[PDB]
Scaffold this motif. Structure first.
Motif, short mmCIF file in Angstrom:
data_model
loop_
_atom_site.label_atom_id
_atom_site.label_comp_id
_atom_site.label_asym_id
_atom_site.label_seq_id
_atom_site.Cartn_x
_atom_site.Cartn_y
_atom_site.Cartn_z
N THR A 172 14.69 4.89 -6.45
CA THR A 172 13.55 5.12 -7.33
C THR A 172 13.06 3.80 -7.96
O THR A 172 13.67 2.77 -7.79
CB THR A 172 13.92 6.08 -8.48
OG1 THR A 172 14.70 5.39 -9.46
CG2 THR A 172 14.72 7.30 -7.97
N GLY A 173 12.00 3.89 -8.75
CA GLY A 173 11.37 2.76 -9.36
C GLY A 173 12.13 2.13 -10.49
O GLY A 173 11.73 1.08 -10.97
N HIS B 268 8.33 3.49 -4.63
CA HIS B 268 7.66 4.71 -5.12
C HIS B 268 6.68 4.48 -6.25
O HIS B 268 6.49 5.32 -7.11
CB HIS B 268 8.70 5.79 -5.45
CG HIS B 268 9.59 6.09 -4.29
ND1 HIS B 268 9.11 6.40 -3.03
CD2 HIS B 268 10.94 6.07 -4.17
CE1 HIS B 268 10.12 6.59 -2.20
NE2 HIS B 268 11.24 6.39 -2.87
N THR B 269 6.00 3.35 -6.20
CA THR B 269 4.87 3.14 -7.05
C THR B 269 3.65 3.12 -6.16
O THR B 269 3.76 2.94 -4.95
CB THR B 269 4.99 1.85 -7.88
OG1 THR B 269 5.25 0.74 -7.03
CG2 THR B 269 6.10 2.02 -8.90
N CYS B 270 2.51 3.36 -6.77
CA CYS B 270 1.25 3.37 -6.06
C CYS B 270 0.19 2.81 -6.99
O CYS B 270 -0.29 3.50 -7.90
CB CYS B 270 0.89 4.79 -5.63
SG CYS B 270 -0.55 4.82 -4.55
N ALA B 271 -0.14 1.55 -6.76
CA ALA B 271 -1.18 0.88 -7.51
C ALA B 271 -2.54 1.36 -7.00
O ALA B 271 -2.62 2.36 -6.28
CB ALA B 271 -1.03 -0.63 -7.38
N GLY B 272 -3.61 0.68 -7.40
CA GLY B 272 -4.97 1.14 -7.11
C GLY B 272 -5.27 1.15 -5.62
O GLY B 272 -5.78 2.14 -5.08
N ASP B 273 -4.93 0.03 -4.99
CA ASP B 273 -4.99 -0.16 -3.53
C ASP B 273 -4.17 0.85 -2.70
O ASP B 273 -4.16 0.78 -1.47
CB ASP B 273 -4.44 -1.57 -3.23
CG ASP B 273 -3.13 -1.82 -3.95
OD1 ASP B 273 -2.39 -0.84 -4.16
OD2 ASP B 273 -2.85 -2.98 -4.33
N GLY B 274 -3.46 1.76 -3.36
CA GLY B 274 -2.53 2.63 -2.65
C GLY B 274 -1.16 2.00 -2.45
O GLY B 274 -0.21 2.72 -2.20
N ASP B 275 -1.05 0.68 -2.58
CA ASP B 275 0.19 -0.08 -2.31
C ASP B 275 1.14 -0.12 -3.52
O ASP B 275 0.68 0.01 -4.67
CB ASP B 275 -0.14 -1.53 -1.93
CG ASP B 275 -1.02 -1.63 -0.69
OD1 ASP B 275 -0.75 -0.90 0.30
OD2 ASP B 275 -1.97 -2.45 -0.71
N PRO B 276 2.45 -0.30 -3.25
CA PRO B 276 3.41 -0.38 -4.38
C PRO B 276 3.11 -1.55 -5.29
O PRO B 276 2.46 -2.50 -4.85
CB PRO B 276 4.75 -0.54 -3.69
CG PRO B 276 4.55 0.15 -2.33
CD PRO B 276 3.15 -0.28 -1.95
N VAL B 277 3.60 -1.49 -6.54
CA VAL B 277 3.46 -2.58 -7.49
C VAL B 277 4.30 -3.79 -7.04
O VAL B 277 5.48 -3.64 -6.75
CB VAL B 277 3.92 -2.14 -8.91
CG1 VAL B 277 3.85 -3.29 -9.91
CG2 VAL B 277 3.11 -0.94 -9.40
N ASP B 278 3.70 -4.97 -6.98
CA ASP B 278 4.43 -6.18 -6.59
C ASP B 278 5.00 -6.88 -7.81
O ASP B 278 4.35 -6.96 -8.88
CB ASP B 278 3.50 -7.16 -5.87
CG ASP B 278 2.94 -6.60 -4.58
OD1 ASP B 278 3.70 -5.90 -3.86
OD2 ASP B 278 1.74 -6.85 -4.30
N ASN C 3 11.73 -14.79 -6.44
CA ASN C 3 11.97 -13.69 -5.52
C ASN C 3 10.81 -12.74 -5.65
O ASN C 3 10.29 -12.50 -6.75
CB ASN C 3 13.31 -13.00 -5.82
CG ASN C 3 14.48 -13.95 -5.74
OD1 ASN C 3 14.83 -14.45 -4.66
ND2 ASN C 3 15.13 -14.19 -6.87
N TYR C 4 10.32 -12.26 -4.52
CA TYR C 4 9.14 -11.47 -4.50
C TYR C 4 9.37 -10.16 -3.79
O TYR C 4 9.94 -10.14 -2.71
CB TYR C 4 8.02 -12.25 -3.82
CG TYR C 4 6.70 -11.52 -3.74
CD1 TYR C 4 5.85 -11.50 -4.82
CD2 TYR C 4 6.29 -10.88 -2.57
CE1 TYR C 4 4.63 -10.89 -4.77
CE2 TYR C 4 5.06 -10.21 -2.52
CZ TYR C 4 4.24 -10.23 -3.64
OH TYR C 4 3.03 -9.63 -3.67
N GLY C 5 8.94 -9.06 -4.38
CA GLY C 5 9.13 -7.76 -3.73
C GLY C 5 8.33 -6.70 -4.43
O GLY C 5 7.32 -7.01 -5.08
N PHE C 6 8.80 -5.47 -4.39
CA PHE C 6 8.01 -4.32 -4.89
C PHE C 6 8.85 -3.28 -5.58
O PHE C 6 10.08 -3.22 -5.40
CB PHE C 6 7.23 -3.66 -3.71
CG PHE C 6 8.12 -3.00 -2.67
CD1 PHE C 6 8.67 -3.74 -1.64
CD2 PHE C 6 8.41 -1.66 -2.74
CE1 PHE C 6 9.45 -3.15 -0.68
CE2 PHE C 6 9.22 -1.05 -1.78
CZ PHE C 6 9.74 -1.78 -0.77
N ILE C 7 8.19 -2.43 -6.38
CA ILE C 7 8.89 -1.32 -7.02
C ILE C 7 8.72 -0.08 -6.13
O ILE C 7 7.61 0.36 -5.90
CB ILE C 7 8.36 -0.99 -8.41
CG1 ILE C 7 8.18 -2.25 -9.24
CG2 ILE C 7 9.23 0.10 -9.11
CD1 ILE C 7 7.60 -1.99 -10.63
#
Lengths: 156, 156, 156, 156, 156, 156
Positions: free
Chosen positions: D4-5, D58-68, D52-56
């Motif tokens: 999960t997030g 089960h998130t969905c930002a405006g673009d539909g993509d997870p939060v970076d 370090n770069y990645g994502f959370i």
């Protein structure tokens, strides 16, 4: 003292490497007075030198400083090492500030035998180099192997 | 011969790096007589130096040996390189044996501008350093930038 | 100038490292005339030196060149560093060309205390070394610590 | 599926690392459909990710993509690993495109205990981050931990 | 789900590597529930794991947790990889907490063919391991290959 | 399960990387049954893979095994990552055993845009590859992009 600018200037040049390609953003610089490498700075940008970077010993460009050289290579070369290289071009910038682009001689690596002029590299590579020096400043562009050779000769 | 202890001792010191932070457990040491770096030893512990480690040229502490310095940095600095640093504290131990803690000067990296005294670092960091020198020995503790400066002055 | 072939030749030898084990395929070589390390070549093979590789200062083998030494170690040793080592054998090849095999002295790393002769290493390790020098050339085989010592003495 | 997030969104977030800080310019990206990491691209610039770069998950930002998320750390974290982090700010850009800045939780590393808001980092560090995303694009600036938390909540 | 504790338990064991030897001080841990590697912590000490470190899948020691294994190797093995190993001993500690010491099977690397029991390693190596787990806690000592095998069997 | 052999087989192929170029001599192999990477072996030679090495998912060559692919790249790609590549040739050997040579697609890196056939690489590079697979075995030679494509199609 015991190292010159090249075997066969300007067709071949000795380059003393200061900063290895694909290294951390540590700008090393040879200090003539101390006769040692010094940390000039940690780069304020998450950038790294796109090629091995160093200078031609016993040259004196306009600024009084030695001619700087990017040496493309398959693997990083350590700071302090001399590599025999051959120029293939020059990146010309205004801040005028030029950076010779060179490749290892056929003796050192045959991979680059087919690079006779800077334009023989992929444009993506050339563009990466000019971007680095801009953003790490006005880039005038690339000039050919003959211009690079003439610049090296005027600095002798 | 051509490198001194600093521009502006004791506020700024030149440090010759012997061992890079986050390097393999190889204890390099500059050998005055040979005028070369030597492998003093491979550490008997799976430990690494927590900061760049080296010495201030032309200092002479009680033992006759140069003053040793830990230089915190964002990236490892190569053995042999001079870095301009500023002391912020000293780790004092009995085996008495002191290790200056310093950061790069604002010229070299602005990241550490806000570190004016050792206590400005996270305690976890300070504790990691004292643990290293204990277990790689009695640790007396940390003392402030002024004490470090006074130690550097007495070694000149 | 200020570094000799060893403390206690031939039982102990100083070795100046030219190429680190497990490094990229860059063949560095100390240049006596320049008094600097030079890139001899990038290896034409996707091979790396199986041990730290360098030479004993102030030796002169048949070719006129210093005696070359492989120093097995737990971690790479940087080019330019002196390590105190002890020979345990020699790899003999025809191209005659010998490579001393040595380990760090007990002072430097106790890991290798139990290696008194080359045959005390795993055969897989020894075979990896002879394969490297063949394929990077006729390999005559391994000879024992006494032969290695005698070779070192004849080169003094 | 089984991650999960966060434990305690938005105060604590799980971040799946895609690209390690101080790595080569390889932009990895988790591919939901393949359920594997893919090479999105080699960066056309001699630049590396500053954290370090990645994502959370089960998130969905405006673009539909997870939060970076950028996770600052003392050492690189491998692609694929989950790290428990806490947001301290957000970098807001127009191409709108936001990047959360977070640090490891006190459980994971106490070094960052004193970073409660993005402005607690050195400005040189913050500026390095915004430069990266500009030049690797219009940077609106930094916003505080509360804004970052609100963005994370709206993406749940 | 599709990986077991070994081909030929207890003489041969499968070990899932969590942390590579000679890596940065990042303690990764496989999370059964998430089915992913997580950063357990950054080590509060400037220490690194002295061998590849991981666990035997589908074992259950006293704590309910899988059996932990140190796998000595010539090169680091990546987190997530399975290696076929054979136990040679066990390090026994009170915090009781045991760590199996194993080497790659002859199929995987013949270098370790001659290590049949933990005491076949140099004592300096064994001591480095026990120091690590103490100081990164009471160390009871080393026990032989048979004890290690019996521990593995009781955890099946 | 959710990854295929390519977008546009045989002009473009997905390659799952098993071993990174310029990595330590650890031969990783994806194990279909375990659904995990395993250490096949440590190479008995001081050799490293000359390019990223892996396989095309859901192919079945003569041996029953997936088609193996060398992907040339500017930087190592991690084991486990999918890269979109395009074949440019095939190295044909008898032990028959073929290795596709491919480059990243223009989307992934434009550096290789000008490599349309294996012979567009420097011969020194091609020779290094065939030497590796010989000496790490009879090498029949290189065949062109069309042959490579036909081999990929017959394995679908």
């Amino acid at each position: 003292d015991n190292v010159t600018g090249g075997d066969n200037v300007p067709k071949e040049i000795n380059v003393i490497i200061e900063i290895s390609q694909n290294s951390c953003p540590v700008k090393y610089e040879f200090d003539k007075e101390k006769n040692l490498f010094c940390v000039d700075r940690f780069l304020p940008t998450s950038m790294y030198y796109p090629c091995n970077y160093g200078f031609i010993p016993h040259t004196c460009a306009g600024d009084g400083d030695p001619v700087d050289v990017l040496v493309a290579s398959r693997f990083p070369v350590m700071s302090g090492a001399v590599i025999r290289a051959r120029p293939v071009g020059v990146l010309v910038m205004h801040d005028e500030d030029v950076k010779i682009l060179a490749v290892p001689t056929h003796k050192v690596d045959q991979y680059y035998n087919n690079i006779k002029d800077y334009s023989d590299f992929p444009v993506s590579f050339l563009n990466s180099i000019s971007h680095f020096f801009t953003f790490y400043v006005s880039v005038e562009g690339w000039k050919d192997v003959t211009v690079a050779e003439k610049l090296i000769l005027s600095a002798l």
